[PDB]
Design a protein around this ligand. Structure first.
Ligand SMILES: Nc1nc2c(ncn2[C@@H]2O[C@H](COP(=O)(O)OP(=O)(O)OP(=O)(O)O)[C@@H](O)[C@H]2O)c(=O)[nH]1
Ligand SMILES: [Mg+2]
Lengths: 486, 66, 63, 63, 70, 68, 78, 68, 66, 64
């Protein structure tokens, strides 16, 4: 046998039922098509592992090793690097508990593997960039910022590996705030000099910068952490506290108000005093006072833990403490819902940038409507192999229509045009596979705004292809090929 | 406070007349702190014998304790 | 990813201290700020979580 | 939950819900804005001396 | 004199005060009052409620379910 | 609390008849209640004619009485 | 509980029947903590009268009944 | 700033709509938390158009719905 | 912390808060005595912090080389 | 209580407890949905700047 699968033949619980996800995938309004990208080894795979630990109840990371859920080829496990990009469709709740479908395209951070990132750009509608806090912005992150400017997608930034400033660098809170503010300033300057549009300027106050540590399951925005303070004391407003945290906003404890100037000497900001210093004291109580004042700190946070959890080693105990402190991941859900549009919302510039026929053609507005009815025309760019490697399966978003398994589909190549009908090839779809990383879901009806693997169309496709109805066909043009960064 | 009166009326027989003429006589099993009552083997009219029933917080105009 | 770990010599230095062996940031356009003390003054009994807790111990850097 | 905004202690007419109105000398308010009225003759003159009129159903009070 | 103090005095004296419902004069409850709670909940003691005066004994009325008790 | 949990269990196992304060007598499965009696009922026929509602949410001010 | 389920299913199409008899059936724009919530394309049928198609109607707790759609499993809010 | 808009109308006679349906034109001297404002020379129509005048009217906010 | 029992054949076998008992199977300890022992064992211990020092000097590279 | 920012400029029509429905430009509102709506015309009269309370406003919609 060929052991190149990493396949889960069983289906896990994933907390919720399958039919709630099946009802959520009919929307294409609460569905967010987002590519995770960044530099090499920035905890993006461990971040998707943290989302799998949130959603899948029985799937947990081991203490000794960091698992890699998206990396499913054996070559990725051998080399110890992400190689092939992976899509995951999941139901995610925000701080308000509203369920949103997430079509996530986790990509490797390698510029020689940036072709997969360009394919994930062509499928997805939003981009989340991972930044290591100790390292900052490097060459592949710069080139992906340039390609995101060219691809015209909504980009939000999560800053990963924030524990390297703390445990590994031992920075003062003022200097750590200075480094993070300089990181935000250089990202905003790079957006200014690549992007000609300056309405998007990324700030933690504006809901653009999330903070994360994917080896300890830390993910919060200012709104999420002010929601944590609101759940502690509900007298505050978490929206105004997220407005008043970042950016030289100094707390005045005599008036209990907020100024733009420090009221006394060595007065720190609301961001520093309410986020950086208590998290530093939390980690100091972990790594210095694990037996003396750790249950005192646990009761101060309102968390109850058993004795064997306190007898654990420091890193999985700290991961469990941060998981119980921040709950599940909700700031990222608000990040990709409130600041990254739906296929229905942001359909227009992607189909403008991709379709050679444009959005001005009637099939163009049928594309931009994100219609579950109407034409069944799609674009499959990434076209994976299988576990045995004998047969192949396509993968793509559905720009409009509903794919059915057994419903016939004509596939058209890149060289297809209105006089070249030779690239047209008709096959019915064998099965429709909603792609999670280590398992796939057999579904029947796939509407617009949805990512799905296609079985049985693997013959005429070379790299990318367009997907149309074989009968009742109209003037269907060909989407633009994947122009690579390299 | 009516908390000890509700604790006494819990598991005890009484009648309750509502604003809409709903008079229900029977054994109230449990009444909450906001006077959300629950009854067993009661006969109501406004109807017949309902048996196990419940009420809202203040839907009854007057509770005649038997 | 390369381990760049600061190693301390004395416990006189704090556990959150700028090492001069680290190259300085030299950080160099405004911020979207709300009204300063015109709205949303904080209520009574709101506080950071570990404001009573001290910053660091001598065994903190040991850990 | 508060007292009435008239302190009251005068010959005044209080109208309840449904327009039922009495007139008499007020004595004092309550936490539910309930007024005790002395010689509360119903101006629609039934008075029983000590009339405990509830502010939950009381709608208006004019001198 | 506060109305809560007047209701407590009427409950202590158990006077046969004519009491109506919350803006509803269909039942005029005249009779002794056993006691009053802190949330103005009234307990009657064989108060005849004329519609058909039928005194029953211990009857509990809510704090805002009575409008005029004189 | 416990009585509301027992009423929700009886509504899940049988057909509970809740007569709300909007004259809505609904026989069916009351899915959940609340501390403010925000009641959600799943697949209940309500008479205002017992028209079936697949999921009905009602407030505690608009509810009056329940029965198993 | 029920407010959290309404906030979760506050994008689908539901009917809100008020205490005044106004039945606004349409897509939910947003559900607040209170009963004052904004709806989208609601055909508010009046009491024994016709409907009015309002693209933005904000509700007080006058909205009594809420006929919810089938976009809510048994363990979706449990 | 609705409280400021209500406070800017103090010392003048304005018309208000009642919960029953009446229209009352009057001038207030002070206001309360539950809209139980003390008003002088208030003429209330009693939902029939017959304006009757009263003084020192501490009419509660359950009676008065809005402005008219 | 290591001042008493550092030279015993069974150092902390008596202590129930550290070991399971007389079988001497599993140890559960405190941070300052690992700090003291980590300071004391500096001669035998290495100073490397990552496997990136072992670039092609690793076991997979040696298996490839053979 | 949170619908004031959506109708802080556009006109809205709300029905009070009297049954009168007034359409006007909501300029300000209170925390208990007591919305001061300037230039309110009730269906026919004019109420001016009318502060319609949250309990009074049983039904409302966006007119302008
Ligand atoms: N110090 C530190 N390391 C982390 C953190 N989060 C993740 N890592 C480590 O970073 C390593 C590499 O990141 P991956 O999880 O493989 O994600 P990735 O960025 O997609 O990796 P590539 O595909 O190579 O780009 C993981 O094995 C983790 O051990 C963190 O918060 N702090
Ligand atoms: Mg990776």
């Amino acid at each position: 046998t060929k052991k190149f699968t990493l396949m889960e033949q069983t289906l896990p619980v994933t907390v919720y039922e399958m039919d709630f996800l099946a009802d959520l995938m009919d929307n294409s309004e609460l569905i967010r098509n987002v590519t995770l990208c960044g530099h090499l080894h920035h905890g993006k795979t461990c971040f998707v592992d943290c989302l799998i630990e949130q959603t899948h109840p029985e799937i947990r990371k081991r203490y000794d090793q960091d698992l890699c859920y998206t990396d499913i080829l054996f070559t990725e496990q051998e080399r110890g690097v992400g190689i092939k990009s992976t899509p995951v469709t999941v139901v995610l709740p925000d701080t308000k508990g509203k369920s949103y479908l997430f079509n996530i395209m986790d990509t490797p951070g390698h510029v020689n593997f940036s072709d997969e990132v360009t394919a994930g750009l062509r499928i997805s509608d939003g981009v989340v960039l991972f930044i290591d806090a100790a390292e900052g912005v490097m060459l592949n992150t710069e080139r992906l910022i340039k390609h995101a400017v060219q691809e015209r997608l909504a980009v939000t930034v999560c800053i990963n590996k924030i524990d390297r400033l703390i445990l590994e660098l031992k920075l003062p809170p003022t200097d750590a705030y200075y480094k993070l503010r300089h990181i935000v300033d250089e990202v905003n300057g790079l957006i200014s000099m690549y992007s000609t549009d300056e309405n998007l300027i990324l700030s933690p106050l504006l809901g653009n910068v999330c903070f994360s540590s994917s080896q300890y399951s830390i993910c919060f925005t200012l709104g999420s952490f002010a929601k944590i303070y609101a759940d502690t004391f509900g007298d505050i407003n978490y929206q105004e506290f997220a407005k008043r945290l970042w950016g030289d906003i100094y707390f005045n404890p005599k008036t209990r108000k907020f100024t733009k100037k420090a009221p006394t000497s060595s007065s720190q900001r609301s961001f520093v005093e309410f986020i950086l210093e208590p998290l530093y004291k939390i980690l100091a109580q972990v790594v210095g006072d694990v037996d003396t004042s750790l249950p005192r700190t646990l009761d101060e946070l309102g968390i109850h833990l058993t004795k064997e959890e306190l007898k654990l080693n420091i890193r999985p105990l700290l991961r469990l403490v941060c998981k119980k402190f921040f709950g599940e991941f909700t700031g990222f859900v608000d990040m990709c819902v409130q600041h990254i549009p739906s296929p229905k919302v942001g359909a227009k510039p992607k189909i403008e940038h991709t379709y050679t026929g444009g959005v001005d053609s009637d099939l163009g507005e049928a594309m931009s409507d994100c219609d579950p009815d109407g034409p069944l025309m799609c674009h499959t760019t990434k076209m994976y192999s299988t576990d045995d490697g004998v047969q192949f399966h396509a993968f793509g978003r559905v720009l409009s229509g509903t794919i059915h398994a057994g419903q016939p589909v004509k596939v058209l190549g890149e060289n297809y045009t209105l006089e070249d009908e030779e690239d047209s090839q008709i096959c019915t779809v064998g099965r429709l596979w909603i792609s999670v990383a280590r398992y796939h879901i057999e579904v029947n009806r796939v509407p617009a705004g949805n990512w799905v693997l296609i079985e049985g169309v693997d013959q005429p496709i070379v790299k990318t292809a367009t997907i149309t109805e074989p009968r009742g066909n109209e003037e269907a043009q060909i989407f633009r090929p994947l122009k690579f960064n390299t | 406070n009516p908390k000890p009166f509700l604790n006494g009326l819990t598991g005890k027989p009484v009648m309750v007349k509502l604003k809409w003429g709903m008079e229900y006589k029977g054994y109230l099993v449990s009444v909450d702190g906001y006077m959300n009552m629950q009854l067993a083997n009661t006969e109501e009219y406004i109807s017949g014998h309902l048996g196990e029933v419940l009420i809202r917080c203040n839907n009854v105009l007057y509770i005649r304790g038997v | 990813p390369n381990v760049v770990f600061i190693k301390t010599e004395d416990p006189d230095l704090p556990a959150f201290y700028f090492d001069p062996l680290i190259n300085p940031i030299s950080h160099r356009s405004q911020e979207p700020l709300p009204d300063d003390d015109e709205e949303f003054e904080l209520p009574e009994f709101v506080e950071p979580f570990l404001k009573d807790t001290p910053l660091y111990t001598d065994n903190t850097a040991n850990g | 939950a508060h007292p009435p905004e008239l302190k009251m202690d005068k010959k005044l007419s209080l109208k309840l819900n449904g327009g039922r109105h009495v007139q008499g000398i007020l004595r004092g308010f309550d936490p539910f804005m309930n007024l005790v009225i002395d010689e509360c003759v119903e101006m629609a003159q039934n008075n029983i001396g000590m009339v405990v009129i509830r502010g939950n159903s009381i709608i208006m009070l004019e001198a | 004199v506060q109305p809560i103090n007047l209701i407590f005095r009427y409950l202590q004296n158990r006077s046969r005060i004519q009491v109506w419902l919350y803006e509803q004069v269909n039942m005029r409850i005249e009779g002794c009052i056993i006691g009053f709670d802190e949330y103005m909940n009234l307990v009657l003691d064989d108060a005849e409620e004329i519609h058909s005066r039928k005194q029953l004994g211990r009857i509990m009325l809510k704090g805002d379910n009575i409008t005029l008790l004189q | 609390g416990p009585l509301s949990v027992l009423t929700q269990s009886v509504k899940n196992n049988t057909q509970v008849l809740i007569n709300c304060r909007n004259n809505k007598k609904l026989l069916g499965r009351v899915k959940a209640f609340d501390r403010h009696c925000n009641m959600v009922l799943e697949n209940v026929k309500e008479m205002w004619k017992d028209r079936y509602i697949s999921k009905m949410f009602l407030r505690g001010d608009s509810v009056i009485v329940v029965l198993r | 509980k029920l407010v959290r389920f309404l906030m979760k299913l506050s994008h689908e199409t539901v009917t809100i029947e008020l205490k005044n008899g106004t039945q606004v059936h349409g897509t939910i724009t947003g559900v607040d903590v209170s009963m004052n919530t904004h709806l989208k394309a609601v055909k508010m049928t009046l009491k024994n009268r016709e409907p009015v198609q309002l693209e933005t109607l904000s509700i007080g707790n006058n909205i009594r009944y809420f006929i919810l759609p089938d976009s809510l499993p048994l363990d979706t809010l449990l | 700033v609705p409280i400021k808009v209500l406070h800017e109308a103090e010392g003048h006679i304005v018309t208000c709509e009642t919960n029953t349906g009446e229209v009352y034109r009057g001038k207030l001297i002070e206001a309360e938390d539950n809209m139980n404002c003390q008003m002088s020379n208030i003429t209330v129509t009693y939902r029939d158009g017959r304006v009757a005048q009263l003084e020192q009217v501490y009419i509660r906010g359950s009676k008065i719905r809005f402005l008219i | 912390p290591v001042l008493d029992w550092f030279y015993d054949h069974q150092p902390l076998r008596d202590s129930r808060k550290y070991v399971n008992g007389s079988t001497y199977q599993r140890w559960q300890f405190t941070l300052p005595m690992m700090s003291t022992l980590y300071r004391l064992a500096n001669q035998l211990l290495t100073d490397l912090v990552d496997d990136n020092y072992f670039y092609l000097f690793d076991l997979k590279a040696f298996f490839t080389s053979k | 209580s949170s619908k004031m920012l959506q109708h802080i400029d556009y006109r809205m029509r709300c029905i009070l407890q009297d049954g009168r429905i007034f359409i006007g430009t909501f300029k300000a509102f209170d925390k208990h949905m007591n919305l001061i709506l300037c230039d309110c015309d009730e269906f026919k009269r004019v109420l001016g700047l009318v502060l319609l309370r949250g309990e009074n406003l049983v039904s409302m919609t966006v007119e302008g």
